[PDB]
Amino acid sequence: RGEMSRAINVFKMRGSWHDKAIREFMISDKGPDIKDSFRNFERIISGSPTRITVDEKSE
Amino acid sequence: PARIAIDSLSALARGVSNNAFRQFVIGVTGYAKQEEITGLFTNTSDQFMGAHSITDSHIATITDTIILLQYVEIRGEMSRAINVFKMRGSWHDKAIREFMISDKGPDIKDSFRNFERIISGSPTRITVDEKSELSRIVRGVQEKGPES
Amino acid sequence: KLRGTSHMKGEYPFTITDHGINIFPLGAMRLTQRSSNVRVSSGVVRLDEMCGGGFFKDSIILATGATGTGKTLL
Amino acid sequence: EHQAIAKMRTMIEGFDDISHGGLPIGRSTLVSGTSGTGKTLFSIQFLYNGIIEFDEPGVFVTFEETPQDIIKNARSFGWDLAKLVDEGKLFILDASPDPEGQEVVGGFDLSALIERINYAIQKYRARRVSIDSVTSVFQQYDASSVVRRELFRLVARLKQIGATTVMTTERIEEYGPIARYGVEEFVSDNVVILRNVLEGERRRRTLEILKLRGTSHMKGEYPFTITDHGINIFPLGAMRLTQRSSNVRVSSGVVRLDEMCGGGFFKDSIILATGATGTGKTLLVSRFVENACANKERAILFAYEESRAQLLRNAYSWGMDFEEMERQNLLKIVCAYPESAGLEDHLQIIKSEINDFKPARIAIDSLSALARGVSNNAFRQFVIGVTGYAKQEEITGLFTNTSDQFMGAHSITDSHIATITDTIILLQYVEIRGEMSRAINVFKMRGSWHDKAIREFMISDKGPDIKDSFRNFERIISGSPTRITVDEKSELSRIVRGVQEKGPES
Ligand SMILES: Nc1ncnc2c1ncn2[C@@H]1O[C@H](COP(=O)(O)OP(=O)(O)OP(=O)(O)O)[C@@H](O)[C@H]1O
Ligand SMILES: Nc1ncnc2c1ncn2[C@@H]1O[C@H](COP(=O)(O)OP(=O)(O)OP(=O)(O)O)[C@@H](O)[C@H]1O
Numbered sequence A: 001r002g003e004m005s006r007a008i009n010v011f012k013m014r015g016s017w018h019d020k021a022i023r024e025f026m027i028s029d030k031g032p033d034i035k036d037s038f039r040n041f042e043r044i045i046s047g048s049p050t051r052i053t054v055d056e057k058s059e
Numbered sequence B: 001p002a003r004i005a006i007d008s009l010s011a012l013a014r015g016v017s018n019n020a021f022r023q024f025v026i027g028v029t030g031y032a033k034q035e036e037i038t039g040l041f042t043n044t045s046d047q048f049m050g051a052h053s054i055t056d057s058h059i060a061t062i063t064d065t066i067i068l069l070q071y072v073e074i075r076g077e078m079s080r081a082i083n084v085f086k087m088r089g090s091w092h093d094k095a096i097r098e099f100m101i102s103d104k105g106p107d108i109k110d111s112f113r114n115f116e117r118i119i120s121g122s123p124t125r126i127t128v129d130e131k132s133e134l135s136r137i138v139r140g141v142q143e144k145g146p147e148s
Numbered sequence C: 001k002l003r004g005t006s007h008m009k010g011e012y013p014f015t016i017t018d019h020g021i022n023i024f025p026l027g028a029m030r031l032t033q034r035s036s037n038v039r040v041s042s043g044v045v046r047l048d049e050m051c052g053g054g055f056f057k058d059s060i061i062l063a064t065g066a067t068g069t070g071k072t073l074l
Numbered sequence D: 001e002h003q004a005i006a007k008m009r010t011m012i013e014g015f016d017d018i019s020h021g022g023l024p025i026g027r028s029t030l031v032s033g034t035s036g037t038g039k040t041l042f043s044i045q046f047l048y049n050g051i052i053e054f055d056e057p058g059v060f061v062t063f064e065e066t067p068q069d070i071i072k073n074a075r076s077f078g079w080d081l082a083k084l085v086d087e088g089k090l091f092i093l094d095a096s097p098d099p100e101g102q103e104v105v106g107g108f109d110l111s112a113l114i115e116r117i118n119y120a121i122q123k124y125r126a127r128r129v130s131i132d133s134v135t136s137v138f139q140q141y142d143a144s145s146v147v148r149r150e151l152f153r154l155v156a157r158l159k160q161i162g163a164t165t166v167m168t169t170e171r172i173e174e175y176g177p178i179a180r181y182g183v184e185e186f187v188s189d190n191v192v193i194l195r196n197v198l199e200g201e202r203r204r205r206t207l208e209i210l211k212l213r214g215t216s217h218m219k220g221e222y223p224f225t226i227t228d229h230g231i232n233i234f235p236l237g238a239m240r241l242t243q244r245s246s247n248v249r250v251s252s253g254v255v256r257l258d259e260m261c262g263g264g265f266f267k268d269s270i271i272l273a274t275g276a277t278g279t280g281k282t283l284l285v286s287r288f289v290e291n292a293c294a295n296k297e298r299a300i301l302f303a304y305e306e307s308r309a310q311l312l313r314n315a316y317s318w319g320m321d322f323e324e325m326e327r328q329n330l331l332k333i334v335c336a337y338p339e340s341a342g343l344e345d346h347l348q349i350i351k352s353e354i355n356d357f358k359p360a361r362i363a364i365d366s367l368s369a370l371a372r373g374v375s376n377n378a379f380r381q382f383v384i385g386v387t388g389y390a391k392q393e394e395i396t397g398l399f400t401n402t403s404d405q406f407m408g409a410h411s412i413t414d415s416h417i418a419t420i421t422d423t424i425i426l427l428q429y430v431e432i433r434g435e436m437s438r439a440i441n442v443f444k445m446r447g448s449w450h451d452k453a454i455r456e457f458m459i460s461d462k463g464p465d466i467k468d469s470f471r472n473f474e475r476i477i478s479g480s481p482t483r484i485t486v487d488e489k490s491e492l493s494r495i496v497r498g499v500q501e502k503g504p505e506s
């Protein structure tokens, strides 16, 4: 929506299992605040997303 | 040995020329084909997602069977996928199947069938009224059958 | 040059080891690689089906993919 | 022939063309070159043929090598010089110093040698003369000044006599000064440089005619090979463009494809099969070779990727038994590594087998296999070679090119050879529904009309199955196509309910 938002992700860890989602986060005076993923978007990695706004199953 | 594996030849190509490498491959490839040895070579394609080539220095062809893993972005998540690209003497599965990674190993689930442009890492979800056609409401031609 | 006869032309890498000079005629080795229809597992069941039975014993299997995909695993 | 300088033939596979005829009669040609380059053979080869082809006795002066050895060595190419030095056709004139020699002797002896050689030439009635390693004579205590005068005397007198002479010169650097005393180059009438350039740990020898006072000739380097038969040159550029073309048609071994090509490949035509790794190329080629033998015609297969054994395993699995093919003496499999020699050689190995077997068809699986390491021009020039040879010989060719980038390769050349080729066959993957399906296409056919669809094909134990086209898909070539449907359910065989039978009975 016209705003440079972030996104943290644990790309690879040889031992552990790590999270496979791309979670956005933000920076305040309290430090980083990881948030929720972009479940509803597409091409996320590319950088310039593309919401899917799928019309449900159309009833 | 009866089996031989070198993890990350892409770890050898470090600095060394392209030709010196290519040669080295043949050197470890041929010697393995003659000595009745089964070999698996690990290669790390410099770029995750989008990779138009599956090697680096173009070793590809000097091989029998290709096994490919590629990151697929889905619903805001980075999930793997595998595919047997080419097998010179066998049949091998054409489909591209995704897979989990736990404490047990690899579980080759299904294939993103309701998807497009997968090889790009970032696919295009395209269910939007699946193979049932606009006839999900069966028109109404089926209003003759049940009577009294 | 080897006056009178023939020879392999060019450079060839050799390694002076604890067993004297050892030259690898990387070009000499011929392309006479015995083959057969024998297959062997991988350690991944389904995967073996995906090949159609298992990798051939006499072959070279290539595993590519981005860092993290899990080639070391396979 | 329009030239004003009379020439005599060396009968050296290649030279007489590059020299537009052969060494200028009554003159001296300086064939110079690095250590082991080819020099002294040329010389010997030059006297040889004159003997065994024109019956012209020759005089060979040795300076460093022992008159015994020259004969001992020349046996490698299969020549009993002995017998000739014996029948009075070849007079070897020793001048090699001695194992218990003094020091100082290269000026008045240079005057004596003239008279010497002048005796044997008058005696044996010779036409050709070789003076191998003059250099060694000055390697006693001399400098540029005394070498141009002394050589000159020798050649000057030699020309007066009427002998067509060849002198040999050594040189430390491959491209730098032509000869040691950087003076021989202007004292001679002609100058034949022989090199053996390194680069990429491999070795490439070439011959070049810098100058031929009086006539024209082919300029620049030309690769040659020293085989069991001696010097062998390739005027890759003297290869005129006047091959024969015919509307005759042959099979591809794949029926449906044939249609797709207007009615079967042209007899005289180069064929290119490009497609990402694992697309199929190797197969087709095998099905091409096969059929050629199924009609009783010869054909060769030069595998640079897969072994002769494996070529059969996968060949049998696809049906078609190569075991028999070999036995019925109809198909010959070469099979080798592109790293086991320089192209010059590889180009000749192929040519050879094409003359000791006379194929009527040929297939080179993975030209791109030969493009490894090598420079594009070097490889492009080699392609023109094979392509060249097979074209002027009515031998149908099917080359295999594997593009370095599956799905998304904006160019099926990579090395840009698609314009020398007559007919291209394209194989490429197609991402349809989480599945890597294949699909072939006939890009171009110079004489035929060929089908313009990008049909899909499947591989079975039986072979290449050419199905139907992805009409309802855009961005095909892109590799991962976009499904846009105007139909699909459109007739073809609607009729719902029970349409099939099963395995019991129909
Ligand atoms: N115990 C585990 N549980 C869940 N996931 C794991 C576990 N171990 C590893 N993984 C996952 O598998 C990946 C490990 O990669 P792996 O060791 O298979 O080699 P690779 O991908 O071929 O090469 P490299 O490790 O150098 O990137 C990690 O990135 C991670 O996502
Ligand atoms: N039968 C043969 N097959 C292949 N190569 C051969 C054969 N016989 C000789 N050669 C090659 O020929 C070359 C010998 O060179 P040659 O005797 O023609 O004179 P030169 O190289 O000009 O001068 P010099 O006496 O200083 O070496 C070597 O490089 C050698 O490998």
Ligand SMILES: Nc1ncnc2c1ncn2[C@@H]1O[C@H](COP(=O)(O)OP(=O)(O)OP(=O)(O)O)[C@@H](O)[C@H]1O
Pocket (backbone or CB within 6 Å): B061, B085, B086, B087, B088, B089, B090, B091, B092, D276, D277, D278, D279, D280, D281, D282, D283, D284, D305, D314, D317, D318, D459, D460, D461
């Ligand atoms: N018996 C078989 N049954 C089914 N499919 C086969 C069989 N043999 C080979 N294949 C298929 O054919 C392909 C093998 O490629 P092929 O040997 O035709 O040469 P290529 O693709 O031109 O070059 P290269 O194999 O060196 O990459 C594989 O990708 C595989 O899917």
Ligand SMILES: [Mg+2]
Pocket (backbone or CB within 6 Å): B060, B061, B062, B063, D277, D278
């Ligand atoms: Mg291949």
Ligand SMILES: [Mg+2]
Pocket (backbone or CB within 6 Å): B044, C066, C067, C068, C069
């Ligand atoms: Mg890695």
Ligand SMILES: [Mg+2]
Pocket (backbone or CB within 6 Å): C072
């Ligand atoms: Mg690793």
Ligand SMILES: [Mg+2]
Pocket (backbone or CB within 6 Å): C001, D034, D035, D036, D037
């Ligand atoms: Mg020498």
Ligand SMILES: [Mg+2]
Pocket (backbone or CB within 6 Å): D039, D040, D041
């Ligand atoms: Mg010599």
Ligand SMILES: [Mg+2]
Pocket (backbone or CB within 6 Å): D281, D282, D305, D365, D366
């Ligand atoms: Mg192949």
